[PDB]
Swiss-Prot record, chains A, C:
Notes concerning its domains: In the homohexamer the 2 domains (called CI and CII) self-associate to each form a 'donut' layer. The KaiC CI domain mediates interaction with KaiB, CikA and SasA. ATP hydrolysis by the CI domain causes a conformational change that allows KaiB binding. The 2 domains communicate to control ATPase activity. In the homohexamer the 2 domains (called CI and CII) self-associate to each form a 'donut' layer; the compactness and local conformation of the domains varies over the cell cycle and impacts function. CII has the autokinase and autophosphatase activities, both CI and CII have (weak) ATPase activity; CI has the clock pacemaker role.
Highest taxon of the lineage: Bacteria
Record region (A-loop, interacts with KaiA): 4-13
Covered range of the whole protein: 488 to 518 of 518
Name of the featured protein: Circadian clock oscillator protein KaiC
Curated annotation (Swiss-Prot), chains B, D:
Species per Swiss-Prot/TrEMBL record: Thermosynechococcus vestitus (strain NIES-2133 / IAM M-273 / BP-1)
Domain of life: Bacteria
SUBUNIT field: Homodimer. The KaiABC complex composition changes during the circadian cycle to control KaiC phosphorylation. Complexes KaiC(6), KaiA(2-4):KaiC(6), KaiB(6):KaiC(6) and KaiC(6):KaiB(6):KaiA(12) are among the most important forms, many form cooperatively. Binds to KaiB and KaiC, the N-terminus (pseudoreceiver domain PsR) is not required for either interaction. 1 KaiB binds to one subunit of the KaiA homodimer. KaiA and CikA bind to the same region of the KaiB(fs) form and therefore compete.
Record remark on domains: The KaiA C-terminal domain mediates homodimerization and formation of a stable complex with KaiB and KaiC. The N-terminal pseudoreceiver domain (PsR, residues 1-146 in these experiments) is not necessary for most KaiA functions, while the linker region (residues 147-179) between the 2 domains is probably required at least for KaiA:KaiB interaction. Undergoes large conformational changes in the KaiABC complex which inactivates the second KaiA monomer, preventing it from activating the KaiC CII domain. The PsR domain binds oxidized quinones.
Protein name listed in UniProt: Circadian clock oscillator protein KaiA
Domain KaiA C-terminal: start-end pairs: 4-105
Effect of residue 28 to F: Induces a change in the structure due to the absence of the hydrogen bond between D-90 and Y-28
Residue window of the full protein shown: 180 to 283 of 283
Similarity remark: Belongs to the KaiA family.
């Protein structure tokens, strides 16, 4: 088969249309302000 | 005081990057539009303007919410939202690639 | 209103589940082979 | 002949980056798993292994197809696919950020 049977945990999180995304900004958008 | 580099110019860039990014999306499905010019414009400015993927990532979400919202009010296949993902991932991947090239390495 | 009325062209492309993605490799994955 | 750097080691990296990337996804929703370690591992190796976003972008699609496929055969909410997008975009954004930092600039 190969072994690496990808699971992930399908059907676990309740997502909507634009369902979460880059919203995590990533803590990068700090570049500037004083 | 950056050579007259005020926080406005940066915002102006953001204002342009915002529209430019947006334009990239609209032309993503262009029949003759060289989206590359849009991606190249955004990429070039993003790099030069020391823009972090954050805004690219964050700005993307906001606009994406704009399309999803309309799809609901207009009851239109929201599937088209995949374009933004292809545009968002492609855009980031394009400028991200430029960064790697802007890195002079020995060898 | 603001002006920038985002359109995009909703309901234009026929996408499936994994609907297209990074498939564009980007022409970057050339890094290596001889 | 890279210091004994054969095309295998690179593939080994790919083999690991493949699983590592994959692991990052599985732990993306971990309750105690420090996905950061996964993202940090992938990020570190991706950079060091001179890995281009291409594979990250391409490798992502393939695995994504793996989940979508199962969802169909298992008839499971495919919405969870959003995680891969959050993981794919987040992952790329994380290592892409490292690249920017690996760029020594005057000033």
């Amino acid at each position: 088969a190969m072994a690496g049977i990808i699971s992930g945990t399908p059907t676990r999180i309740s997502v909507d249309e634009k369902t979460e995304l880059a919203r995590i900004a990533k803590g990068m958008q700090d570049l500037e302000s004083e | 005081a950056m050579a007259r580099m005020s926080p406005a110019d940066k915002r102006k860039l953001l204002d342009e990057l915002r529209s430019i990014y947006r334009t990239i999306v609209l032309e993503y499905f262009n029949t003759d539009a060289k989206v590359n010019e849009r991606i190249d414009e955004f990429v070039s400015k993003a790099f030069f303007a020391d823009i972090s993927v954050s805004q690219v990532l964050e700005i993307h979400v906001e606009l994406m919410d704009t399309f999803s919202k309309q799809l609901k009010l207009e009851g239109r296949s929201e599937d088209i939202l995949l374009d933004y993902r292809l545009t968002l991932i492609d855009v980031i991947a394009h400028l991200c690639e430029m960064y790697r090239r802007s890195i002079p390495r020995e060898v």
